[PDB]
Structure 1
């Protein structure tokens, strides 16, 4: 009912930071509420019996309504002392193994709290042996290890090739590729919004072929809108927008036939802006030059005064027709084209094959690749009279080009919404293509923690492999809440492990998942382990304290340490902890065949292994998960398959049986 809770709060220019401590239990939590109401709610939620605040705490209104208030100096909330004091308190060399190291705003609160805590109770704090971050956002929790290890957007090397991105990123428009990338780094867990994606994707699988080509015409409209807002847009950017505007009626027609209320809602959000289409069609030339600085952008008939300044230019336009023709006749070069340049003025460009067939009257102006631009006095004279009056047309053409923003800026907000909706459509049509192509299934979300996969596969590994993945199922529940996965080196024991992680993540982007059938429960935190002890066990310490009943744990090659007795002993304790205490969803890829005695020791754990058939020095890996344990070591058999000399392999097998004779 009533708790004696100690707490602290601090803010910088960025946001707020919060920490608590219960002296009854020894629970020690941390958070970074970004906005004010979240911060007010967190103080109200925890209801600390004693609350710390910095003398210069700006938004005092939050803490003017809390009890047991304490005014503290600023210097106590310094991160340097905080990190130092908390390291000494827990006996750690870093706070990376609490997953709070990269939350300095809150650690200011935690730092000030502990310095105060060690002093308020002035008692031994062995029960307070860990701090943990509770994210204010409870949609998803993704650490850097997961993004770098599951390879959602970045492979182990650091490249963006053979990622989940690269696979799903067959998006026709670039703004779709980015919205796809953001979704993967922020998997939605509003089951309603996820189902809104799953119903949209199901409806578009059939209509995906018709819409994709229309979406490819649009291009990156979102980045064009960013330049339009800055008033720095280019004519060829406005041409892409006009090209995109012409597609909106076509997209509105194709999405009208699709039976999906979210699609119909997206279709209304899409808009038309056919007024803005009409504007640009009338305003701009069908294919204008690269920059507005050149002019020759805005088509004649839009502005009459542009035509008055371009009255000289109108005479000038068929003067360039008369000069291009006369010079094409005289020289005998048909690739001869007269065009404008802001730096040099008007020039005569000829193809490189016909460049040196030009006469001596032609003076070199610009040297290009597969072209040579020239100048003559008649043009250079004509260039001057045009540059000036067409300059007052170009100044007006640039002034009218700014006025095009003034006609687009009323809808700018609606165009961004439309662009985001168009970008979202590309993503969900792209996913609808991928799901249709790869026959992905729609996973349905349940209330209790667990994933029930029917013949599921690794969504990325199956695409990059030269062999069809051996699809295998998974039955996770709070009854079967742990799997000890033993197997060979380069055996593929880390596939079924990683495939499970992607399936959850792919399910939580509302996208159809790589399996025959999946039924999944709440997975809020993904915690991962992958080799390189001063880096490896630091992550294992972070996954142990942070991981909950709902968190998906993926430990790979754990206990690669100073011996086979230190690594096993830790691995034994970690597997026990996650089965005995936390009872968290854990996927333990390991070589420790001694840990295969845990399914009989522990409740929740199951022995699985990757079947591999070895004949002589060469070997075949079935890459197929079988319920059991690895028969023996295969690094000998793999070593030859990697290319290691047979002299080493023979000597390995000769030294093996001298060591295997002991054990």
Structure 2
């Protein structure tokens, strides 16, 4: 179970994937993972530029679905082509919007292609709703040029209808015919196409030749139109700039979504350095999360939050681990100011009995063996769940082996000997969480240096004073 799942990283993915406008944005968000450092700094620069300069996005997913269908040999039965062409037209308009900015957004937009040869071919063929126009091919215009007067002349020749005794021309099997009355059917010699039983659609002999011509022309129309549409489909397949444009569109969707996550969750851009320093940091997934400030550097490598148990100790562990993980993946981080180191590997021992203590020792054991001076360790509930005497003896040895490593991070425990160990030791400082006695609730507030409550609480709950004299 990787540290991403322990620190609830995939919930940050799902919040990010809420704000993606396109499926391409969602796929990047839902696969998001920590990055090499100077790529992740580019995402931070992109996120800051997106906050300054918002932009719209085309329908990249519908473009990609049409683009995939065209590559597969399907006649991309347009429009669909017009929707795909309109996405490319908006993509190019998006590109020329971002280029003058002369920044990281403009560099991403440089991968948006020149799709004018596809656009001009489409717009000369079909531009208004995806009806294939007459002039899309010279053959089709000639075929249309006989379709209109032949179709009108059939309707002109069907009065006829106006000699006789239910007074509308209709199509059956895409041939023109007339609804005679069943008794009067001898007045209109023709061919029976349909009856309703409730009558007698008859195609008169005089329009049989015209309908035979009209049917024959419509076959030649449809054969040419599909030949045009298949040609347009293979243009979209053979446009080599589409995948690079789609990659740019997907990345710009992710960056804008990252900006929205920073806007909504109150995130700020981290800066990277040789040490940890966070000012008013919080856990972004906790509503009304309370801000705490702390630092880790080479002089003080490990922070030991020696409590009575929690009221926010485990949350502060998950706060620091998320901030480093979200910074390394190019997101902003949940603080007002954050200076962060770059750990090679983040170790989190986070989950209270003897066999939960055994689970803690496994992740500590990997922590002992393989963590380096560049690593970041998050250790929860250290020494709890076992014998408090040998548990403190084991925990102190593990801590000073990690101090001997040079590793950085935070450790929480409630074992009394360890709080005196940290005060009498280099490289580790004590901390605690302030508890509100008047309300009997934790304040979730870090107190930097003061490591108690028990009789004080028993007073406030008004236990008998005879009990609370022998104490």
Note the C-alpha offset of 1:217.
4.6
Note the C-alpha offset of 1:583.
2.1
Aligned to 1:174: 23
Q: List aligned pairs for 1:261-660, cutoff 5 A.
A: 262-283=104-125, 298=132, 300-303=134-137, 361=196, 400-412=228-240, 414-435=241-262, 440-446=267-273, 448=274, 450-461=275-286, 465=287, 467=288, 469-487=289-307, 491-531=311-351, 535-559=359-383, 561=385, 563-565=387-389, 567-580=391-404, 582-615=405-438, 619-628=440-449, 631-632=452-453
Q: Deviations over 1:352-410 (max 9, x none)?
A: xxxxxxxx9599xxxxxxxxxxxx989xxxxx999998677666655544433431233
Is the partner of 1:548 in helix, strand or coil?
coil
Note the C-alpha offset of 1:493.
1.2
Distance 1:386 1:434, change over 3 A: farther
Note the C-alpha offset of 1:244.
1.5
Partners of 2:331 and 2:215 lie apart in 1 by: 56
Distance 1:544 1:312, change over 3 A: farther
Note the C-alpha offset of 1:455.
2.1
Q: List aligned pairs for 1:213-292, cutoff 5 A.
A: 214-215=56-57, 217-219=59-61, 221-231=63-73, 235=78, 238-260=81-103, 262-283=104-125
**Is the CA contact 1:491–1:623 (under 8 Å) kept in the aligned structure 2?**
yes
Aligned to 2:161: none
Partners of 1:626 and 1:474 lie apart in 2 by: 9
Q: How many residues align?
A: 422
Distance 1:575 1:267, change over 3 A: same
Distance 1:401 1:481, change over 3 A: farther
Note the C-alpha offset of 1:305.
5.1
Note the C-alpha offset of 1:633.
6.8
Partners of 1:589 and 1:385 lie apart in 2 by: 89
The gaps in structure 2 that reach 5 residues or longer are 154-165, 175-194, 203-211
Q: Deviations over 1:82-127 (max 9, x none)?
A: xxxxxxxxxxxxxxxxxxxxxxxxxxxxxxxxxxxxxxxxxxxxxx
Which one has more relative contact order, counting CA pairs under 8 Å at least 6 apart?
2
**Is the CA contact 1:555–1:588 (under 8 Å) kept in the aligned structure 2?**
yes
Partners of 2:22 and 2:342 lie apart in 1 by: 32
Note the C-alpha offset of 1:429.
2.6
Partners of 2:293 and 2:83 lie apart in 1 by: 46
Distance 1:176 1:479, change over 3 A: same
With 389-398 and 537-546 compared, the bigger mean Cα shift is at 389-398
Partners of 2:292 and 2:346 lie apart in 1 by: 21
Q: What is the alpha-carbon root mean square deviation over aligned residues?
A: 4.7
Partners of 2:429 and 2:329 lie apart in 1 by: 29
Note the C-alpha offset of 1:175.
0.9
Q: Deviations over 1:271-318 (max 9, x none)?
A: 341332333444457556xxxxxxxx7555424556778889979999
Partners of 2:430 and 2:305 lie apart in 1 by: 6
Distance 1:508 1:609, change over 3 A: same
Is the partner of 1:269 in helix, strand or coil?
coil
Is the partner of 1:153 in helix, strand or coil?
helix
**Is the CA contact 1:164–1:460 (under 8 Å) kept in the aligned structure 2?**
no
TM-score, normalised with respect to structure 2: 0.72
Distance 1:572 1:219, change over 3 A: same
Note the C-alpha offset of 1:220.
5.5
Q: Deviations over 1:250-291 (max 9, x none)?
A: 31343134241x322222212341332333444457556xxx
Q: List aligned pairs for 1:110-129, cutoff 5 A.
A: none
Distance 1:483 1:278, change over 3 A: same
**Is the CA contact 1:175–1:220 (under 8 Å) kept in the aligned structure 2?**
no
Partners of 1:361 and 1:195 lie apart in 2 by: 73
Partners of 2:421 and 2:214 lie apart in 1 by: 87
**Is the CA contact 2:350–2:379 (under 8 Å) kept in the aligned structure 1?**
yes
**Is the CA contact 2:13–2:30 (under 8 Å) kept in the aligned structure 1?**
no
Q: Deviations over 1:600-635 (max 9, x none)?
A: 3432111112222144xx63222211124664479x
Distance 1:274 1:317, change over 3 A: farther
Note the C-alpha offset of 1:475.
1.4
Note the C-alpha offset of 1:148.
0.8
Partners of 2:390 and 2:146 lie apart in 1 by: 88
Q: Deviations over 1:34-63 (max 9, x none)?
A: xxxxxxxxxxxxxxxxxxxxxxxxxxxxxx
Q: List aligned pairs for 1:78-227, cutoff 5 A.
A: 144-154=1-11, 163=12, 165-167=14-16, 169-182=18-31, 184-189=32-37, 191=38, 193-208=39-54, 211=55, 214-215=56-57, 217-219=59-61, 221-227=63-69
**Is the CA contact 1:218–1:243 (under 8 Å) kept in the aligned structure 2?**
no
**Is the CA contact 2:57–2:91 (under 8 Å) kept in the aligned structure 1?**
no
Is the partner of 2:252 in helix, strand or coil?
helix
**Is the CA contact 2:70–2:234 (under 8 Å) kept in the aligned structure 1?**
no
